[PDB]
């Protein structure tokens, strides 16, 4: 069993020419098309055998059984998501979790443990290419670690999935791979840190990372790990001041308020769930977790990275911090400004942090902006839930440098870096607000990054097999839709449009879509809601498809004020912890997303990037059960099926010359000569015997380039050809058998003694009760085979076939009738050359006896009145034999014996003989 079923397909566990349908169902199903009608098809399922309606372009084709469980979903000659859906599925249900498509590398989590990741199978990964072994995690470790060395440059791995996908757990094994191949363990503690101050649940997930996380490498010019530090790119700030209904702010606020102890409240000021403004929706549980005992997990998890007691205590008091921030109560009566009538809050919030009380209300209410600049109640509260934003953002990246810290360098050495990209994956809700904008418009360009790479990848792939062939970069088709959320002006974007309306506070939500659809309602990608007045105000055309945004308290999320008075407080606060969070200062929340990806992008731009999917196959965390719905989403989402469009248009079938050879030589059998090889010739002359289109086909240098669908083709003239040779070379080889044993059977000679005759007689019956049986009942079978190529033969929408020179299973039996009539013809002829056999052999008995009892008598009558009774006794004896000797060849004559002379004259030799022993008397 193990490791070896986990991996190949060969060594896995376990022709009505079918399509696939969309369904709900399952993902898709197989149909029969049988009558099309208008432009609209009627088909029949398969399985269950039922009927049902679709249309024609909703049918998408499906692979031969010789692409069933590919390693890499390029080698498909059907693309098509019914495909991709189907292979991935297929390779699940077998125990095969990892699959390639494309540059893709995509794994399924069995939510099991495979007895793989062993360092017997690591160093069996070592120095081989990708198609060399099944696919794996390592491959794309190798991959990169293989290229660092050879291309020079850095590398960098972007995997795409959710916190439950396993997405953890399959960066771990990319770490235990690079770390074998060149000679750690805390690096692995640093993940339940991060996952406390860094993740979320969400409406989808009760673990969500609303970070970007970047795990590098860093390797010597030798090629040997120097060490390793962690970056974070797109935290979500936002989170913390507030949260969407029945979704939660991040993990360590609710396992600091639960699992604090009785003096640690009184000391950081902590309060009831209920108490807090920044958290929305009160207190939320989360189903098998509870956060009182995750905040001691999360302590003891600092300890072992080793964190002392005075710096998580100062990291628990900035959380406390943030959400006393909201509880700062402003007020509004009526000149205008702010106004603070409680005096008991931020007094908390001055103690937490490093500062003055009074110069803080000073400066919150009234800041002084390079003199003295007043505020309103509506800028005050934007700018306190800015300041708990901005605080906790700063001890985030805080919290990753300091973990650095922890981390072991043994060598100086400037070096180089393989990066690891952890970040949330495309995100489709049925509301969709100002977040899930922010997340797509990054893996909107995560996935132009796949679209230019998978360009320049196999732009030199045609070069190397010299083959002229121009595209246009597929980044590009991701170009207008980033403009249309990120540009300045041309006419200003959606981030750009709504950074303007949150400078003037009569601007509503309303107007803000209002001048969207006026600005650009040109954009192709830029859409509007059917009719009537739909939830979502409008609509952006992704990679991934259609989704609806709402606007929904938009200008809220996207303000950002920062208080340059208080900040400056910050700076110079009291508490050492505090003023290093704030040591360096300098704003739409937009403003700093587009900001923080620019820095992404330039980092990833400078490497070479990688790709693997994590997917997860169902909600119920169970093995072996995929949802097919689910996973369909999510090949929509990380841009598989992206990927999948772009091959297509290109020749993605690549074979080469020896294996196309080897399977389609049947489909050309006299084309190609007896072997002379040379390869490359062999099949530009099945390519002219075929007849193949020209523009079907490439030939590269090692390989030949195929469109989508020509293998299909092929495959299934093969089967067609294989069935077809196969029952023509069985037919000829029982037809001349046939026509060589009747030919034999009609031989009439049968030897010139009676024991050559029953040997005959032995050999005939020995005939039909052993050779003729399985000559026998071939021919039901052939007629078997015969009927079984009609059938499939009508399956592929084509004419019957004509088998030449009476091969047909009617033309069959009809020899083989008049060959078993031939057999008794035979059989009695031989029993009648038997009697013949048998009364020559005893008529020449008595002819022998005859003959050779008078030559005893020459004999001893040769010692010689009784001389002339003696020599009467001569001629009466002789008259008596010589009578029946003429009596005995006479009946001979009539049964044709055709050594008559032979006896003949030897009769006469002895006449000669008695004429001696006649005149010896005289």
Same mark, same amino acid.
């Given at each position: *069993?193990?490791?070896?079923?986990?991996?190949? #397909?060969?060594?896995?566990?376990?022709?009505?020419?079918?399509?696939?349908?969309?369904?709900?169902?399952?993902?898709?199903?197989?149909?029969?098309?049988?009558?099309?009608?208008?432009?609209?098809?009627?088909?029949?399922?398969?399985?269950?055998?039922?009927?049902?309606?679709?249309?024609?372009?909703?049918?998408?084709? /499906?692979?031969?059984?010789?692409?069933?469980?590919?390693?890499?979903?390029?080698?498909?000659?059907?693309?098509?998501?019914?495909?991709?859906?189907?292979?991935?599925?297929?390779?699940?249900?077998?125990?095969?979790?990892?699959?390639?498509?494309?540059?893709?590398?995509? #794994?399924?989590?069995?939510?099991?443990?495979?007895?793989?990741?062993?360092?017997?199978?690591?160093?069996?990964? &070592?120095?081989?290419? &990708?198609?060399?072994?099944?696919?794996?995690?390592? +491959?794309?470790?190798?991959?990169?670690?293989?290229?660092?060395?050879?291309?020079?440059?850095?590398?960098?791995?972007?995997?795409t999935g959710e916190s439950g996908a396993g997405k953890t757990e399959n960066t771990k094994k990319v770490i235990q791979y690079l770390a074998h191949v060149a000679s750690e363990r805390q690096l692995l503690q640093a993940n339940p840190i991060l996952?406390?101050?860094?993740?979320?649940?969400?409406?989808?997930?009760?673990?969500?990372?609303?970070?970007?996380?970047?795990?590098?490498?860093?390797?010597?010019?030798?090629?040997?790990?120097?060490? $390793?530090?962690?970056?974070?790119?797109?935290?979500?700030?936002? %989170?913390?001041?507030?949260?969407?209904?029945?979704?939660?702010?991040?993990?360590?606020?609710?396992?600091?308020?639960?699992?604090?102890?009785?003096?640690?409240?009184?000391?950081?000021?902590?309060?009831?769930?209920?108490?807090? %403004?920044?958290?929305?929706?009160?207190?939320?549980?989360?189903?098998?977790?509870?956060?009182?005992?995750?905040?001691?997990?999360? /302590?003891? $998890?600092?300890?072992?990275?080793?964190?002392?007691?005075?710096?998580?205590?100062?990291?628990?008091?900035?959380?406390?911090?943030?959400?006393?921030?909201?509880?700062?109560?402003?007020?509004?009566?009526?000149?205008?400004?702010?106004?603070?009538?409680?005096?008991?809050?931020?007094?908390?919030?001055?103690?937490?942090?490093?500062?003055?009380?009074?110069?803080?209300?000073?400066?919150?209410?009234?800041?002084?902006?390079?003199?003295?600049?007043?505020?309103?109640?509506?800028?005050?509260?934007?700018?306190?839930?800015?300041?708990?934003?901005?605080?906790?953002? &700063?001890?985030?990246?805080?919290?990753?440098?300091?973990?650095?810290?922890?981390?072991?360098?043994?060598?100086?050495?400037?070096?180089?870096?393989?990066?690891?990209?952890?970040?949330?994956?495309?995100?489709?809700?049925?509301?969709? @607000?100002?977040?899930?904008?922010?997340?797509?418009?990054?893996?909107?360009?995560?996935?132009?990054?796949?679209?230019?790479?998978?360009?320049?990848?196999?732009?030199?792939?045609?070069?190397?097999?010299?083959?002229?062939?121009?595209?246009?970069?597929?980044?590009?088709?991701?170009?207008?839709?980033?403009?249309?959320?990120?540009?300045?002006?041309?006419?200003?974007?959606?981030?750009?449009?709504?950074?303007?309306?949150?400078?003037?506070?009569?601007?509503?939500?309303?107007?803000?879509?209002?001048?969207?659809?006026?600005?650009?309602?040109?954009?192709?990608?830029?859409?509007?809601?059917?009719?009537?007045?739909?939830?979502?105000?409008?609509?952006?055309?992704?990679?991934?498809?259609?989704?609806?945004?709402?606007?929904?308290?938009?200008?809220?999320?996207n303000m950002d004020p920062l208080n340059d008075n208080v900040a400056t407080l910050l700076h110079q606060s009291s508490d050492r912890f505090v003023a290093e969070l704030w040591k360096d200062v300098d704003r739409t929340v937009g403003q700093l997303?587009? *900001?923080?990806?620019?820095?992404?992008?330039?980092?990833?731009?400078?490497?070479?990037?990688?790709?693997?999917?994590?997917?997860?196959?169902?909600?119920?965390?169970?093995?072996?059960?995929?949802?097919?719905?689910?996973?369909?989403?999510?090949?929509?989402?990380?841009?598989?099926? *992206?990927?999948?469009?772009?091959?297509?248009?290109?020749?993605?079938?690549?074979?080469?010359?020896?294996?196309?050879?080897?399977?389609?030589?049947?489909?050309?059998?006299?084309?190609?000569?007896?072997?002379?090889?040379?390869?490359?010739?062999?099949?530009?002359? /099945?390519?002219?015997?075929?007849?193949?289109?020209?523009?079907?086909? %490439?030939?590269?240098?090692?390989?030949?380039?195929?469109?989508?669908?020509?293998?299909?083709?092929?495959?299934?003239?093969?089967?067609?050809?294989?069935?077809?040779?196969?029952?023509?070379?069985?037919?000829?080889?029982?037809?001349?058998?046939?026509?060589?044993?009747?030919?034999?059977?009609?031989?009439?000679?049968?030897?010139? @003694?009676?024991?050559?005759?029953?040997?005959? /007689?032995?050999?005939?019956?020995?005939?039909?009760?052993?050779?003729?049986?399985?000559?026998?009942?071939?021919?039901?079978?052939?007629?078997?085979?015969?009927?079984?190529?009609?059938?499939?033969?009508?399956?592929?929408?084509?004419?019957?076939? #004509?088998?030449?020179?009476?091969?047909?299973?009617?033309?069959?039996?009809?020899?083989?009738?008049?060959?078993?009539?031939?057999?008794?013809?035979? +059989?009695?002829?031989?029993?009648?050359?038997?009697?013949?056999?048998?009364?020559? +052999?005893?008529?020449?008995?008595?002819?022998?006896?005859?003959?050779?009892?008078?030559?005893?008598?020459?004999?001893?009558?040769?010692?010689?009145?009784?001389?002339?009774?003696?020599?009467?006794?001569?001629?009466?004896?002789?008259?008596?034999?010589?009578?029946?000797?003429?009596?005995?060849?006479?009946?001979?004559?009539?049964?044709?014996?055709?050594?008559?002379?032979?006896?003949?004259? %030897?009769?006469?030799?002895?006449?000669?003989?008695?004429?001696?022993?006649?005149?010896?008397?005289?």
């Amino acid at each position: *069993e193990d490791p070896e079923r986990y991996l190949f #397909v060969d060594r896995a566990v376990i022709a009505k020419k079918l399509v696939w349908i969309p369904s709900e169902r399952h993902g898709f199903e197989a149909a029969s098309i049988k009558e099309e009608r208008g432009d609209e098809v009627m088909v029949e399922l398969a399985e269950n055998g039922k009927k049902a309606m679709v249309n024609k372009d909703d049918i998408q084709k /499906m692979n031969p059984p010789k692409f069933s469980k590919v390693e890499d979903m390029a080698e498909l000659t059907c693309l098509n998501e019914a495909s991709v859906l189907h292979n991935l599925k297929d390779r699940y249900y077998s125990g095969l979790i990892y699959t390639y498509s494309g540059l893709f590398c995509v #794994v399924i989590n069995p939510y099991k443990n495979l007895p793989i990741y062993s360092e017997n199978i690591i160093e069996m990964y &070592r120095g081989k290419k &990708r198609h060399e072994m099944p696919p794996h995690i390592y +491959a794309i470790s190798e991959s990169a670690y293989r290229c660092m060395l050879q291309d020079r440059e850095d590398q960098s791995i972007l995997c795409t999935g959710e916190s439950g996908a396993g997405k953890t757990e399959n960066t771990k094994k990319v770490i235990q791979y690079l770390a074998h191949v060149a000679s750690e363990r805390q690096l692995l503690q640093a993940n339940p840190i991060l996952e406390s101050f860094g993740n979320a649940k969400t409406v989808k997930n009760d673990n969500s990372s609303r970070f970007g996380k970047f795990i590098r490498i860093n390797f010597d010019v030798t090629g040997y790990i120097v060490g $390793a530090n962690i970056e974070t790119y797109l935290l979500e700030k936002s %989170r913390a001041v507030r949260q969407a209904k029945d979704e939660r702010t991040f993990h360590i606020f609710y396992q600091l308020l639960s699992g604090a102890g009785e003096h640690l409240k009184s000391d950081l000021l902590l309060e009831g769930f209920n108490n807090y %403004r920044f958290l929305s929706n009160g207190y939320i549980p989360i189903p098998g977790q509870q956060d009182k005992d995750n905040f001691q997990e999360t /302590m003891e $998890a600092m300890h072992i990275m080793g964190f002392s007691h005075e710096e998580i205590l100062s990291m628990l008091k900035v959380v406390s911090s943030v959400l006393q921030f909201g509880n700062i109560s402003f007020k509004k009566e009526r000149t205008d400004q702010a106004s603070m009538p409680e005096n008991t809050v931020a007094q908390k919030l001055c103690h937490l942090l490093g500062m003055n009380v009074m110069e803080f209300t000073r400066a919150i209410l009234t800041p002084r902006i390079k003199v003295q600049k007043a505020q309103t109640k509506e800028q005050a509260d934007f700018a306190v839930e800015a300041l708990a934003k901005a605080t906790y953002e &700063r001890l985030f990246r805080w919290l990753v440098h300091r973990i650095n810290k922890a981390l072991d360098r043994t060598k100086r050495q400037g070096a180089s870096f393989i990066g690891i990209l952890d970040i949330a994956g495309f995100e489709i809700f049925e509301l969709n @607000s100002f977040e899930q904008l922010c997340i797509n418009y990054t893996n909107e360009k995560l996935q132009q990054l796949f679209n230019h790479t998978m360009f320049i990848l196999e732009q030199e792939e045609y070069q190397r097999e010299g083959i002229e062939w121009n595209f246009i970069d597929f980044g590009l088709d991701l170009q207008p839709c980033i403009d249309l959320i990120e540009r300045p002006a041309n006419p200003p974007g959606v981030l750009a449009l709504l950074d303007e309306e949150c400078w003037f506070p009569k601007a509503t939500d309303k107007t803000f879509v209002e001048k969207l659809v006026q600005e650009q309602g040109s954009h192709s990608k830029f859409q509007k809601p059917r009719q009537l007045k739909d939830k979502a105000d409008f609509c952006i055309i992704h990679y991934a498809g259609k989704v609806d945004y709402k606007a929904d308290e938009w200008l809220m999320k996207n303000m950002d004020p920062l208080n340059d008075n208080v900040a400056t407080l910050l700076h110079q606060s009291s508490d050492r912890f505090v003023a290093e969070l704030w040591k360096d200062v300098d704003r739409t929340v937009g403003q700093l997303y587009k *900001e923080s990806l620019t820095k992404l992008m330039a980092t990833l731009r400078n490497t070479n990037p990688n790709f693997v999917r994590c997917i997860i196959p169902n909600h119920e965390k169970r093995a072996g059960k995929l949802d097919p719905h689910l996973v369909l989403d999510q090949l929509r989402c990380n841009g598989v099926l *992206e990927g999948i469009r772009i091959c297509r248009q290109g020749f993605p079938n690549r074979i080469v010359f020896q294996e196309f050879r080897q399977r389609y030589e049947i489909l050309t059998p006299n084309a190609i000569p007896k072997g002379f090889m040379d390869g490359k010739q062999a099949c530009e002359r /099945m390519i002219r015997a075929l007849e193949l289109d020209p523009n079907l086909y %490439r030939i590269g240098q090692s390989k030949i380039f195929f469109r989508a669908g020509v293998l299909a083709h092929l495959e299934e003239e093969r089967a067609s050809e294989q069935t077809k040779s196969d029952y023509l070379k069985r037919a000829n080889e029982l037809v001349q058998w046939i026509n060589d044993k009747q030919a034999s059977l009609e031989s009439r000679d049968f030897g010139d @003694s009676i024991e050559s005759v029953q040997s005959f /007689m032995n050999a005939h019956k020995e005939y039909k009760k052993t050779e003729k049986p399985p000559k026998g009942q071939e021919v039901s079978e052939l007629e078997a085979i015969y009927n079984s190529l009609q059938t499939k033969l009508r399956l592929i929408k084509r004419e019957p076939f #004509v088998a030449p020179a009476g091969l047909t299973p009617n033309e069959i039996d009809s020899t083989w009738s008049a060959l078993e009539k031939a057999e008794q013809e035979h +059989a009695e002829a031989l029993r009648i050359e038997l009697k013949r056999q048998k009364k020559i +052999a005893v008529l020449l008995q008595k002819y022998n006896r005859i003959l050779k009892k008078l030559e005893n008598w020459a004999t001893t009558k040769s010692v010689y009145k009784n001389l002339e009774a003696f020599d009467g006794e001569c001629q009466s004896l002789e008259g008596q034999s010589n009578s029946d000797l003429l009596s005995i060849l006479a009946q001979l004559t009539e049964l044709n014996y055709n050594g008559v002379p032979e006896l003949t004259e %030897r009769k006469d030799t002895f006449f000669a003989q008695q004429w001696t022993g006649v005149k010896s008397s005289a």
